[PDB]
Write a protein that binds this ligand. Structure first.
Ligand SMILES: CCCCCCCCCCCCCCCCCC(=O)OC[C@H](COP(=O)(O)OCCN)OC(=O)CCCCCCCCCCCCCCCCC
Ligand SMILES: CCCCCCCCCCCCCCCCCC(=O)OC[C@H](COP(=O)(O)OCCN)OC(=O)CCCCCCCCCCCCCCCCC
Lengths: 69, 71, 344, 309, 93, 96, 172, 111, 96, 80
């Protein structure tokens, strides 16, 4: 009954990687931010706009209130 | 607000696609600049070829294919 | 079986209603699509492999006769996009319109579409159902009418009676003799249609009645020509005069009423100074009677009724609405002061 | 670095089932009063790494009675779509944010029947010619029993996409309104993926050591996938934005228990004797499926509880 | 733009492995049955009328509902009446 | 545009000599359903960009009858092969 | 990944039809359709419409093709062959295959070739022509299939499907 | 046809990010109400937005002072409010429900 | 022929899925929506036999709305107005 | 016919339960008043923009102020 417990802790740990990996990529690719999702064409229009006015070329950075004062 | 922030853009966008079109060639078999293809002098909505000319390097793909085939 | 034999028979006319009652190109797509799906089991019932080797030749013809129509339908979607049943706004589409539609009303092209189907079917009971497929696409042509290339429609009609006048000189199968001359009247009512589409249906109504009486008189015993020798002195001598009352009328002689549309077909066709074309058709219609003479010479002259087997028993067929049918098919030529007023 | 997300999902999922044939037997072992792999491991854990070496040493002799262009074509698609179906699946973040993906899983799984028709047909006679047909003929009957009751929960969850499916199950464990559907979900998914009660499943016996391993490796790939697909649908987990790690901790560990169920049901039951096997679908399953299909329409209407989208 | 660069790695990985499997590390130098046909035709009939059944969750965020209620139930009826006449004859199936 | 010119040649896979001929008669009925999807897509080009929003049912209801017509003629070729075993369209007995 | 990625699939979609246009010993004809219609499914997935093309996988490519592939085994029980391995197959495969690139060869590669064969320029973004942006309602194309006003279609088309079963509930 | 010049362009566009633009998003239009509905009649009732170019700047001008107003008086609970909703994913309005009161305690009070 | 049952008894079979601008379930128009509303207004009481000789104008710009035919002809020759003088200067305009 | 429900429910207890779900599903949407609350919500979901109109004399109702009690009351749901 004991020996099956190392059997569980191999294949089950082998699924822990990609959920950890992907959540440490898109978080890493946007600098500690989640990825902006786009499901409707009105939602994409913000990212199509805001990338052109972010600072140079990025959608994961913001301007804030202090931009135009 | 953003409606007023979009129509302002295309009046700018059509101008530099027209002002840089008037200065191309003043040919005797050339176009009268400012003509219309239609007869009815009204405001038709412009076409994707009229916003962006034959430039077509990245940014034109960045406009039409923006929502399409991913976020 | 006998419950759904009505239900299959019910949905055929349900198809051609939707063909008539619509303002929409996709419903008239569906219309004689489900008709072509409703005709197949009527061909089958006794499950003989000749009937299967006749319906499948009937099948993939009318499949294309469906599927070519939609290729015309998407063109005037790309050309002005309106879906009212009207002019097609493209001669490349109206060409694709008619000469696809002419398959189901089979013209002088698409030759063996009619006889190879109708011969080889054991169900000679009816097989009057191939009057419905003569009825439905005529109810589209009344609305396609004022956009046709005007030369294609008359070319198929002059050729129509030319082959149909020639086909039954080489025949004994009275099904094929009745498969032919179904090309004949379908050349005339196309040849009117550029000039007054009303009174086209006058040719259509007379053709229905004189074909309805023909197979009901053929549902006594006869399927072969020499089998029409052995009924005058065997089955009933009263049928021998009545079959001569119709074969001579459908040839078109003026004292009977079979001549009546061809009387009126010229009063419309001339007064628009087309003279050489009705003369070529009427002189071709002379040959339409030499099918019937050389056939009526067999049944009404007692040509050797051999094979001694006497029918002392009575007859119980279903002669449904039969005896009232050759009363407007003979003596109605005085009785039409205005058939072009109630129909038109 | 989008490419390194790809290789850190395809490669770490192969070891997820290459180390499962071990677990297949040990769970089978400790029911029968017997131990696992004893001499090689020591705890077993050194067994499949050596056995993976053998099937590429041992000579793959080819049939002279078959074509070659068709015979290796079915293992091409076997790793193709049965691994492609992993892609728009969240944990809690999917690789692709598809706007509709529940149709996309069924669109790929419908081509699973299109692989078995290859290998039996292009190879040989009888067994590989008639015996490989029936297995398509059972697995064509389990899409209508699959897709209809699938549609009956989208009526209440709200839409087609999978990202909204987590938020709508944050208080529920949605087996509770669909415990009749929970049987006919799990029974039907068991039957499609060719396992022990629903088995008749010559489409393997001709494969030597080379390409048998693929259609043993792809078939196992399906079975944890129907576990992970039932996992996000029925037994939804909690979500934390500030702590994404805590999602995946209690995510795969729930799918790993249902992974044992295919190993656990296999140790109980006999077969179903093919004539009954389709007879228990049309006569028995399917009329209840239409009834509950009518059930999940009227009740969100007669609640004024339509899910928003 | 990686969809389309997303599966291209997956399919080049499968066709790679067969070359190390079937190729270079090897180097060796129907009767007809009617009852097994009619179920495929029967399946495709119920395969069509679930695709017309398919657009339901978008058909709820809509206008006046009793049009969409009473008509969507009618397709299930035609899917069920089709069973019953066919239930009169299934064969050894 | 060129996207309309191709696909328009793709409609001319309904070549009639390769639509009822030659034998292996399943290859004939092959391009019949192959003539479908040359009309499903070609319609769905113009319906989609010119935002009609109402004729979206039209290509969907097209494919409903497209398989349903294709369902019928496949059944009859079994009835051909029921008494024969092979299709072989050069089979001909019933003449005109 | 270039600008011409939509058009270049369409030319590939043309050649999938030519693969079964002669006589591909009809088991490869199924493999002529799956390669075609999937690429044909790729063409529909542009231009806004996502949902309406993906069903063609299920209803036709998973639906019709399997039952299509379920035949040619219950019938045609002779010995098949790989196509192009004969001289009856390759006798016309190249003929229209030359014109498929020859149609592209001068539609726009010359300056003006000529009047009615140079009307449609290749590219560049006018193939889409979909600006400006839209709404947050749907695709749309998303609110596309409605059990509003079209109901006369559904009562007819469903009832046509019912009597299709009965005709196949009989003879076979 | 004709188009107006490069003049009556280059006016002060509100160069803010999309999250901080959707941050307030609710108190913004709910109190201005004079140029916007007039601009809607200028666009919906009468088409051709070339006779209609002037009031697109007027409603733009009102937003200029609007963010200048919130910056001068109460912005510290505002800057933390679009901080949490910047932590992305679908921009739900229930994750930042807690911090909403610290912003909204003074919008009815300070100004 | 066209019996028109739906005219007397006042229900529509469809009559809605007919033109480009009839229903639009959430008031979302089409691209050439503005020319349907004009071209119908031209010939309504016209009996269609003089309509091909009287209106003749609002059909044209409508038909060319659907294709943008000469617009594509006018735009393509700009690639021959410029872009044969590529090495002959005329960048026009400089970025941005 | 009273034992007819008790000589088939002890004989084939599968489709018997189906017809009971065929029942109790058609009848009840025409019964409880929770419906037509389904209609009031599904119409009061704003997709598009409510465009204002032009005044000329009247003014029957609804001046320019949005926060005035000038329109309907769908705010029962927030209180619900
Ligand atoms: C007195 C009537 C004749 C005697 C009774 C009828 C017996 C009979 O059935 O004969 C039918 C006969 C047809 O001739 P056939 O078939 O060649 O030979 C059969 C002879 N048993 O001949 C026929 O009677 C065929 C019927 C001829 C067409 C109907 C006419 C009816 C005549 C009776 C009414 C008289 C008034 C009609 C004429 C009015 C003229 C203004
Ligand atoms: C009025 C209020 C509204 C309505 C509410 C009513 C609620 C009703 C809920 C019903 C839904 C579940 C029932 C679904 C049908 C189950 C299938 C079935 O019962 O078939 C019975 C099967 C066939 O044989 P049978 O008809 O019984 O004939 C022999 C008679 N001695 O005979 C059998 O018994 C064999 C059982 C099937 C064989 C497969 C068993 C394999 C083991 C599977 C284990 C499943 C574990 C649980 C599922 C996993 C959880 C996700």
């Amino acid at each position: 009954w004991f020996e099956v417990l190392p059997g569980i802790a191999v294949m089950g740990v082998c699924l822990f990687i990609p959920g950890m990996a992907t959540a440490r990529i898109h978080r890493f690719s946007n600098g500690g931010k989640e990825k902006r999702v786009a499901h409707y064409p009105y939602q994409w229009y913000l990212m199509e706009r805001d990338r052109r006015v972010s600072g140079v070329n990025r959608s994961y950075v913001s301007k804030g209130l202090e931009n135009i004062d | 607000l953003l409606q007023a922030e979009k129509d302002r853009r295309v009046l700018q966008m059509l101008r530099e696609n027209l002002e840089e079109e008037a200065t191309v060639m003043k040919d005797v078999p050339g176009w009268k600049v400012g003509e219309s293809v239609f007869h009815t002098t009204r405001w038709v909505t412009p076409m994707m070829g009229e916003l962006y000319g034959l430039r077509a390097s990245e940014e034109v793909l960045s406009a039409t294919y923006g929502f399409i085939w991913y976020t | 079986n006998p419950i759904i034999f009505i239900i299959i028979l019910l949905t055929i006319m349900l198809g051609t209603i939707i063909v008539m009652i619509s303002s929409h190109w996709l419903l008239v797509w569906i219309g004689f699509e489900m008709n072509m799906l409703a005709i197949i089991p009527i061909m089958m019932k006794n499950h003989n492999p000749r009937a299967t080797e006749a319906s499948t030749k009937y099948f993939l013809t009318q499949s294309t006769a469906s599927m070519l129509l939609m290729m015309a339908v998407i063109i005037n979607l790309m050309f002005s996009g309106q879906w009212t049943v009207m002019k097609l706004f493209n001669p490349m589409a109206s060409m694709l319109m008619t000469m696809a539609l002419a398959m189901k009303l089979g013209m002088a092209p698409f030759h063996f579409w009619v006889p190879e189907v109708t011969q080889g079917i054991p169900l000679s009971s009816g097989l009057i159902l191939l009057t419905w497929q003569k009825l439905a696409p005529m109810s589209v042509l009344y609305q396609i009418f004022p956009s046709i290339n005007l030369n294609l429609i008359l070319t198929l009609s002059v050729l129509s009676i030319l082959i149909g006048g020639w086909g039954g000189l080489n025949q004994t199968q009275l099904r094929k003799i009745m498969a032919y001359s179904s090309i004949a009247h379908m050349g005339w009512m196309t040849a009117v249609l550029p000039y007054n589409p009303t009174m086209t249906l006058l040719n259509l109504i007379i053709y229905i009645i004189m074909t309805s009486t023909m197979f009901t008189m053929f549902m006594a015993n006869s399927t072969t020509t020499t089998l029409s020798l052995s009924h005058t002195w065997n089955k009933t001598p009263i049928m021998t005069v009545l079959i001569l009352a119709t074969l001579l009328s459908m040839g078109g002689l003026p004292p009977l009423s079979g001549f009546m549309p061809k009387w009126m077909i010229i009063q419309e066709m001339t007064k628009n100074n087309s003279i050489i074309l009705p003369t070529f058709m009427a002189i071709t219609a002379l040959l339409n009677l030499y099918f019937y003479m050389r056939l009526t010479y067999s049944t009404t002259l007692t040509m050797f009724p051999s094979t001694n087997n006497m029918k002392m028993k009575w007859q119980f067929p279903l002669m449904k609405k039969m005896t009232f049918l050759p009363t407007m098919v003979v003596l109605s030529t005085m009785m039409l002061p205005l058939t072009p007023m109630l129909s038109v | 670095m989008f490419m390194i997300n790809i290789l850190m999902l395809i490669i770490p999922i192969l070891l997820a089932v290459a180390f499962l044939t071990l677990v297949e037997r040990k769970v089978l072992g400790y029911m029968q009063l017997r131990k696992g792999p004893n001499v090689v491991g020591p705890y077993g854990l050194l067994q499949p790494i050596a056995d993976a070496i053998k099937l590429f040493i041992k000579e793959p002799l080819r049939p002279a009675t078959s074509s070659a262009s068709m015979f290796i074509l079915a293992p091409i698609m076997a790793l193709g779509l049965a691994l492609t179906m992993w892609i728009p699946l969240p944990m809690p973040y999917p690789l692709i944010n598809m706007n509709l993906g529940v149709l996309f899983m069924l669109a790929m799984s419908s081509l699973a029947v299109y692989s078995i028709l290859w290998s039996g047909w292009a190879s040989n006679s009888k067994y590989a010619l008639i015996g490989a047909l029936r297995a398509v003929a059972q697995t064509i009957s389990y899409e209508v029993t699959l897709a209809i009751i699938l549609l009956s929960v989208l009526l209440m969850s709200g839409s087609f996409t999978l990202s909204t499916l987590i938020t709508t199950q944050e208080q529920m464990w949605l087996i509770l309104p669909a415990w009749p559907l929970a049987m006919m979900w799990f029974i039907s998914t068991l039957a499609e993926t060719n396992r022990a009660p629903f088995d008749l499943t010559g489409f393997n016996v001709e494969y030597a050591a080379g390409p048998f391993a693929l259609f043993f490796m792809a078939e196992y790939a399906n079975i944890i996938m129907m576990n992970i697909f039932t996992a996000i649908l029925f037994l939804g987990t909690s979500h934390n934005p500030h702590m994404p790690e805590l999602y995946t901790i209690n995510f795969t560990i729930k799918s790993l228990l249902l992974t044992m169920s295919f190993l656990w049901i296999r140790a109980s039951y006999p077969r179903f004797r093919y004539d009954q096997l389709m007879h228990l679908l049309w006569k028995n399953f399917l009329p209840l499926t239409l009834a509950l299909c009518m059930w999940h329409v009227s009740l969100p209407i007669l609640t004024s509880g339509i899910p928003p989208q | 733009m990686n969809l389309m660069l997303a599966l291209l790695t997956n399919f080049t990985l499968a066709t790679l492995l067969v070359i190390i499997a079937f190729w270079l590390p090897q180097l060796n130098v129907l009767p007809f049955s009617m009852k097994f046909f009619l179920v495929a035709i029967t399946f495709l009939l119920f395969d069509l009328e679930i695709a017309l059944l398919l657009p339901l969750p978008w058909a709820s965020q809509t206008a006046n509902l009793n049009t969409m209620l009473t008509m969507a139930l009618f397709l299930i009826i035609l899917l069920a009446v089709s069973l019953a006449y066919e239930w009169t004859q299934k064969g050894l199936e | 545009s060129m996207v309309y010119m191709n696909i328009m040649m793709a409609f001319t896979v309904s070549l009639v000599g390769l639509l009822m001929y030659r034998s292996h008669l399943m290859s004939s009925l092959l391009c019949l359903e192959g003539m479908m999807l040359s009309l499903f897509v070609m319609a769905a080009l113009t319906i989609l960009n010119s935002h009609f929003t109402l004729a979206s049912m039209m290509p969907i209801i097209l494919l409903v009858f497209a398989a349903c017509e294709a369902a019928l003629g496949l059944s009859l070729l079994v009835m051909v092969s029921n008494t024969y075993g092979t299709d072989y369209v050069q089979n001909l007995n019933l003449l005109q | 990944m270039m600008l011409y990625i939509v058009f270049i699939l369409s030319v590939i979609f043309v050649m999938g039809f030519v693969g079964f246009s002669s006589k591909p010993s009809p088991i490869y004809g199924g493999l002529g359709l799956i390669v075609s219609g999937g690429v044909g499914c790729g063409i529909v997935l542009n231009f806004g419409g996502s949902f309406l093309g993906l069903m063609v996988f299920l209803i036709y490519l998973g639906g019709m093709m399997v039952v299509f592939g379920y035949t040619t085994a219950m019938a045609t029980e002779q010995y098949p062959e790989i196509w192009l391995s004969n001289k009856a197959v390759l006798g016309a495969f190249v003929t229209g295959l030359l014109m498929e690139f020859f149609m592209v060869y001068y539609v726009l590669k010359d300056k003006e070739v000529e009047v009615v064969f140079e009307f449609n320029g290749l590219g560049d973004w006018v193939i889409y022509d979909t600006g400006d942006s839209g709404f947050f309602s749907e695709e749309a194309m998303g609110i596309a299939a409605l059990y509003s006003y079209g109901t006369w279609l559904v009562i007819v088309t469903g009832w046509s499907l019912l009597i299709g079963v009965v005709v196949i509930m009989e003879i076979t | 046809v004709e188009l107006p010049s490069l003049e009556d362009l280059k006016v002060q566009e509100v160069k803010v990010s999309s999250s901080v633009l959707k941050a307030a998003a609710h108190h913004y239009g709910a109190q201005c109400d004079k140029p916007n509905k007039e601009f809607m009649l200028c666009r919906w009732e009468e088409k051709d937005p070339r006779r209609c170019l002037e009031e697109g700047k007027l409603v733009n001008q009102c937003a200029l002072e609007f963010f200048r107003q919130i910056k001068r008086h109460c912005a510290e609970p505002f800057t933390e409010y679009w901080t949490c909703i910047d932590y992305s994913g679908l921009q739900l309005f229930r994750r930042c429900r807690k911090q909403q009161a610290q912003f909204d305690e003074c919008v009815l009070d300070k100004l | 022929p066209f019996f028109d049952v739906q005219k007397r008894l006042g229900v529509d079979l469809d009559r809605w899925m007919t033109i480009q601008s009839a229903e639009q379930p959430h008031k979302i128009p089409s691209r050439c929506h503005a020319f349907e509303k004009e071209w119908i207004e031209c010939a309504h009481g016209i009996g269609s036999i003089r309509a091909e000789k009287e209106c003749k104008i609002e059909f044209e710009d409508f038909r060319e709305c659907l294709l943008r035919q000469k617009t594509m002809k006018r735009l393509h020759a700009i690639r021959r107005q410029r872009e044969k003088l590529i090495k002959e200067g005329k960048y026009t305009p400089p970025p941005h | 016919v009273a034992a007819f429900l008790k000589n088939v429910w002890a004989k084939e207890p599968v489709l018997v339960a189906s017809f009971a779900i065929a029942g109790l599903a058609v009848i009840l949407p025409t019964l409880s008043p929770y419906t037509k609350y389904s209609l009031m919500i599904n119409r009061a979901t704003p997709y598009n923009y409510p465009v204002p109109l032009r005044d000329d004399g009247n003014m029957p109702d609804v001046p320019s102020h949005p926060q005035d009690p000038q329109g309907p009351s769908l705010e029962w749901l927030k209180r619900l």
